[PDB]
Amino acid sequence: MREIVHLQAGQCGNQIGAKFWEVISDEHGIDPTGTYHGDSDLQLERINVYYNEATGGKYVPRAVLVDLEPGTMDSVRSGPFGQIFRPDNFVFGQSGAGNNWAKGHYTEGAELVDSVLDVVRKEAESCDCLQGFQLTHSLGGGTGSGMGTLLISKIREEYPDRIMNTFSVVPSPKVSDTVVEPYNATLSVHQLVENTDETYCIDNEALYDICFRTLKLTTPTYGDLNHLVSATMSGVTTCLRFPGQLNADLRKLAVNMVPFPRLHFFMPGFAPLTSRGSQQYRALTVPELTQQMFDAKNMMAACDPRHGRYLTVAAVFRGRMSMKEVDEQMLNVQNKNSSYFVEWIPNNVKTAVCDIPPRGLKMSATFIGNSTAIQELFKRISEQFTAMFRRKAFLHWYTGEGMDEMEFTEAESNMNDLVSEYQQYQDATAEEEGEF
Amino acid sequence: MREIVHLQAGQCGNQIGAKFWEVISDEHGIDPTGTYHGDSDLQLERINVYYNEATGGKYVPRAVLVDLEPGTMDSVRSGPFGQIFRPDNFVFGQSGAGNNWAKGHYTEGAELVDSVLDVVRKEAESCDCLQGFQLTHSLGGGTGSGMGTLLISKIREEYPDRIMNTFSVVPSPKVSDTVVEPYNATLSVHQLVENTDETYCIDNEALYDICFRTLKLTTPTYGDLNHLVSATMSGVTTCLRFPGQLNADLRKLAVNMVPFPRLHFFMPGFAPLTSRGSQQYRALTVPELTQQMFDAKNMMAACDPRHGRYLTVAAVFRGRMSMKEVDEQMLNVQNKNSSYFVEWIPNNVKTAVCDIPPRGLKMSATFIGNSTAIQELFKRISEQFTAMFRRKAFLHWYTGEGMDEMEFTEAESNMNDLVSEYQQYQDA
Amino acid sequence: VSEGFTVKAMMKNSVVRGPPSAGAFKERPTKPTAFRKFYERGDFPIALEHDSKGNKIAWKVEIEKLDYHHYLPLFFDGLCEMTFPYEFFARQGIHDMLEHGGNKILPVIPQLIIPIKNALNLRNRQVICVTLKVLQHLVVSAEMVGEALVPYYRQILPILNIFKNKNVNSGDGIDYSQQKRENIGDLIQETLEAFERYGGEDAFINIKYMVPTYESCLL
Amino acid sequence: PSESIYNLIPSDWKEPPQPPRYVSIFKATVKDDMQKFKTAMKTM
Amino acid sequence: MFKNTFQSGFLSILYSIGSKPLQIWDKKVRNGHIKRITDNDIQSLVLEIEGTNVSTTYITCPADPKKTLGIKLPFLVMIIKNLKKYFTFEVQVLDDKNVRRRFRASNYQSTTRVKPFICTMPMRLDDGWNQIQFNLSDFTRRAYGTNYIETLRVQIHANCRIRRVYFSDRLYSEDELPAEFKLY
Amino acid sequence: MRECISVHVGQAGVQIGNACWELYCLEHGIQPDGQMPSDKTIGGGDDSFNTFFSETGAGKHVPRAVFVDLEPTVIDEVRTGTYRQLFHPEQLITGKEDAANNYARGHYTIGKELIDLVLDRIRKLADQCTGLQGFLIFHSFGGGTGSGFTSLLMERLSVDYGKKSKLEFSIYPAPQVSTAVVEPYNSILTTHTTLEHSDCAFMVDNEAIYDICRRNLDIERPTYTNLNRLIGQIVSSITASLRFDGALNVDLTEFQTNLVPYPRIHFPLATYAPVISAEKAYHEQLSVAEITNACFEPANQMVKCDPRHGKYMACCLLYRGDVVPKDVNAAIATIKTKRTIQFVDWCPTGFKVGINYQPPTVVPGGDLAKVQRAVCMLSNTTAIAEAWARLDHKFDLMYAKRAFVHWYVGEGMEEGEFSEAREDMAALEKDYEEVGMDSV
Amino acid sequence: EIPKDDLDFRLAALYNHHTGTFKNKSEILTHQETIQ
Ligand SMILES: Nc1nc2c(ncn2[C@@H]2O[C@H](COP(=O)(O)OP(=O)(O)OP(=O)(O)O)[C@@H](O)[C@H]2O)c(=O)[nH]1
Ligand SMILES: Nc1nc2c(ncn2[C@@H]2O[C@H](COP(=O)(O)OP(=O)(O)O)[C@@H](O)[C@H]2O)c(=O)[nH]1
Ligand SMILES: Nc1nc2c(ncn2[C@@H]2O[C@H](COP(=O)(O)OP(=O)(O)O)[C@@H](O)[C@H]2O)c(=O)[nH]1
């Protein structure tokens, strides 16, 4: 009964999602044509979480693919595992965005919206009991949330009533090489909080560092960067798909990681990542997974955890395992550095044991964490709106469209207060007297 | 239970450790790719001592390999036993020391120590119980002597209760291999006094004659020469790895050898060393074996024990034999010449035995010895250095890298008291 | 002597160091105000009437016919500075124009949220008292203002969560500083029921959404 | 508690020294036995 | 202890007008605070106890947990201001069959339950300042078939404002109550 | 004739019963396919299966169990496992969505969508019953359906069946090892219902079974399966005298009248002393005295609270195997001579004794050993108060900042119920205090 | 002092079963005579 519909937006949703669907097709045992050629029965028992049976033994995914450029999702439909998607789910526009955020919200207001809503409707309703949705996208481009708060303000009307995850690619802190860039960082936020509240923020700079320093791949493309996120997406849904000794679905993760309703921050991580020449010389034990998933290196978000406090930790593991090693991770690191595990929460770790491991690997994990060091992620974006907002010089391209600039200035006000709300629960202690 | 972390720094320490892990793999049945094609179970029981274990039945050594620099140990990784080491334990940086103690300890040894210490904690946190560390390196080099003694200082600050061994090649007396040899030797010995508790002194010269007068092979190389220091590193710690009538460990071979904390520079050796032509000419018995153990020409240091007095002797033994004959003979060799053993220790000799001899021999033994006569080595080096430090020869290659001449003077001061303390216990 | 989630600091005997800090409960550096630039220009029709009742503001032009769209966001921007000959004009001038006039406090509400959160974001324990008094006075001294602030709780309340439980634990010894109200937690609390009693229905949930410690009164 | 003032005087009592270290009557034999079967410079 | 005291028609154990009102009382403050001063309608000092956790911060009339004050007076009256928050309070009594028995009144309880060592009942406060009269001799008779002997403890929890916690020999009307016991 | 229906609720409760009904079928001659084998007999018939199994006309034994749970793919493990034809397909009933570790979701939102069907199946299972002793429930204090749906079940079973011996087995949140962050919320809410609707609530902790598996059983890295077999061994010993004759046959009603002294004190401490591995079991003799001693040892308890900080009230000893009454009396006497084992002065007798002649049965693939005799201990101490004061410290630490409360208030409960649940817990400590101080 | 093995475990082993987490069968008991 419990089921997920995958919405992919942009190149980023489409390229990450296409890698995600081939991962799940390997995990469940589906060939590129769409039939089942698996070597087990539990690879088929709960395949009504991501695939629908079509007549002829042809399993078809449940992803609707959304983009405003026709060209992008022709490569998706002609990829390795690319013909599995049903054509009606492939919903295209004719002109997208570019350069100006102000163009992005004074361009295609409502054309492609209702077409997607029809596809999202039929695919959700022709089923049994909706666990929720998941959305893959990045925060960038020539629109930011310009198409976003244009198109999705028509979809957010009733969507926050059930579960909706979002694996979002947050901008990287390297250089500003989009010329008139620091106007799409300010106008991005608005409802950046109160419509998902389960966002798995994934930076590309941190994606390279795990590929350079941890995986030691000499030439990492964007493709194998999309392999790392696909493991995490599979990780947070493996207890729903495959049986386990300690089950934990999306809601059980969401309930057990979100104390306050404004916490769309879950920095991901995959524990058993090893180089090819070093995989042979690897122990692969329960402590070995735990010392990597909690490490600052294996964090797919450019925020060092030792800059703040873990408000809550999830430990969805995969295999035949233990969990008490994670208890020593608090008791050593928490009681000695109390600033790395929030003390007004007694135990900060949720664990899960899903019996079936990933392919090839014997044992794995999937860390997501609500650390209060994510104040810095929406602070690098914070010094990257203030830096060029005040001049408004190349904004004459914006000015031609140029919507209300209170909406320019209210978005960061709904972002710096989010930082403040994280600064509070990083500094808030049990006996509320000693911080004043 | 009690396991040993291998450390190796510099070119010499890696050439020695290349052949060290060859014979440990041979004794414990490990093949080049790291799978146990052994014979008995006793070669698999105490295998955690040197070899860790990885998924796939693979026995990864716990050794870490330290150098500043990636373009040479084709000797190891393209050698017979180089695939056994994991590629993560190899640690390196950009520019080499190049036989300079200042470069490997201060400038290029400032950024690699963070990388080496990170790896050795990873090897030391996967333990039920760490028995101790041990190092093989050069004493007159740039990376073996400069970096190697800085790694010793870093471990001692972090693991003070653990035991650290040093299998260092001390400078050869007659023909040297490096021009700046005493500068690196003096600065590294000075740090070795207070940062180690069991230090091994090796002359390449004494290995040459052992290779000739005893082993009787005409054309030597560093393969069979490093085999002598290889099986000494093995044979000392076989009491950890194999049982005996009464066994030992590194701790028992240190408390029973080091009277005073500044006196831990030892002399190793082997008793059974015969050629193929001498197999039919000599009997492998305990009296014939223990005779050539104490022979001065058999020693691995180019300084005779006859010039001084032995402070403490120990021997580890092997093979199913009598404890009576080995006990009465080492009384016999101790009491017949009392001018070489100190009067204020009634029994200078320690006996340890094992039950499993090496492959190819039915009984073998390894000698370890603390003598006053190792001051002969340090007192040459002390006047090597005052021949060169006095006129400031080769000093701008040290002063210009951030150190002063005071550290040279403290190294003379520490070595000269260590010499004066050795001569003090020569007289009873 | 260690960092955190490393191989180091997992041993049987280790000591460590935490983060730099958390930037909360701490005074932030102020910025130059538009109140400062507009006062030295002389555009304000105000005068510091040094009365023998304490200081008062004498208005050369009558308060009823002022352009409230250009003055209330400009007086509210002066709350984030503490030097005397400007901070009193912000404190007294806001209170004077709030209780005078009607049917013009309403259209200036949505352009009043930015200068009222900026003074609250300073996190110093002086003007946070001042902004809490004008927040109590804003909802009272007009008609149908609490309903206007219900969709704007998301930009005023996050600072009120940080200092909500700021009180004195003087169990028996009596305090004397209730004449001039410096107790932040009582001022945050009393503003919250003033927020909830006005605005009608669907107002308790907007406060409960984001300061969950609050108990919804008016049952 | 019945006390007396003739107790505030310092106790001015030193411990008599221990008997001297007992030289054994068999020590003169074990000097000769230990210094027996000993020569110099035999093997080396 | 309050045993040698006559225990006349009136006996006060806490009154906010004095040097140290919380002298015999024991203060336990946890994620809350205690203070003494606010003049809203009566221009007088009234003790405040309030906190974010109602069951954790409180005040108990006997300081030592082993000592128990013995008051034979059946009626228990406190003057407590309504704050529209969670307020609970204790009273522990000694019974004729020698059982330590407790009673609880709470704002956040729907229905009452009675069973052998605690009887919890609901309560509806008024709009502002009010006095409540906890008839101990009747509540020890309706809840259990038992007579009243003496109370042993009273304990006041968070989110309330306190003045003149006292016992009385019988229920008094407002006119016959003396001047220092009035609401105003 | 005497019998009891077993209820298994939650992923914890379902997994306990799977290793528990594995023991029950093997304790009798019952195979996984329900039918007893024609060839080979496990023993005399005696109609001893009647306490847990129902006999049909075709010669099939059917467990009197309902596997009610909101989590679909832990029951489908049973539905495709070895014990497939043992259970009815309609005895095993599943929800559509989990409660997601929420007491409110298992009680109010999802719980009302399935409470009607499970009471219909409980009624139909109990309709063919004649002399039903009571019910047994199995759950944990940390789950959503293990705490929320369990609480709703006792609410409905109290009025449908009146006053009936309704035993309870539960899993406590440990002091340190805990798989959830909202676990102190669920435990403090389900005890608010357990305290008034459970006649006896057996108290079991994960860390203590972790401790006795590594120390007594000498197994490294124990899993949930090993904890499951230890619990099912005790529950078999609780219902041991219902099926097999003994010197002192003790009933479920005789448990309650001899363990719990007052209507809030129904939280016994569980202890199984002869838990020992096979390589060290047959070496030494296992006298009945030394296993009575091992019941009072601090580390052999299955809840993390030693009785040295408390005082015993009533101890129920359930011996199985070749046990004569006279040397039990010697074992009880030598316990009473120790002043370190503190007994309350209002229970001079102190002990309730039950002897059974059937030794415990070993499961293939298990880690226990075949012992001639064994003992289960049901203590009752004031030392359990410190196991709950820690839970209040865990509750008050995060309730004071209203953490995770909107995950409860939005799903059909008010904020005052949290203070009402801590309320009975704030009285339960003082209820254990007032039965501890000596009368003077 | 101790008459039998039960009192040896029951006496001052200094092991709080409420506080002691994940000990070994050697540190199950730590007598006061062992410490000092
Ligand atoms: N002894 C034992 N305890 C278990 C076992 N499985 C789960 N538990 C306990 O269950 C707790 C986890 O929460 P659960 O009660 O299982 O949650 P649930 O039953 O799935 O209920 P929902 O959260 O609504 O899905 C852990 O803290 C364990 O203590 C088991 O096999 N043996
Ligand atoms: N991982 C990943 N990131 C991408 C890919 N394509 C774009 N990005 C990131 O997204 C940013 C711009 O993409 P964007 O313009 O938003 O794509 P759009 O959503 O179609 O408009 C770049 O900085 C990239 O780092 C991809 O295929 N994989
Ligand atoms: N016994 C032995 N000694 C060696 C070997 N290789 C080098 N050495 C000695 O090591 C010294 C050179 O030091 P080196 O390793 O280059 O120091 P580094 O530059 O810091 O690495 C020379 O004096 C040699 O005598 C070897 O294979 N065996």
Ligand SMILES: [Mg+2]
């Ligand atoms: Mg579940």
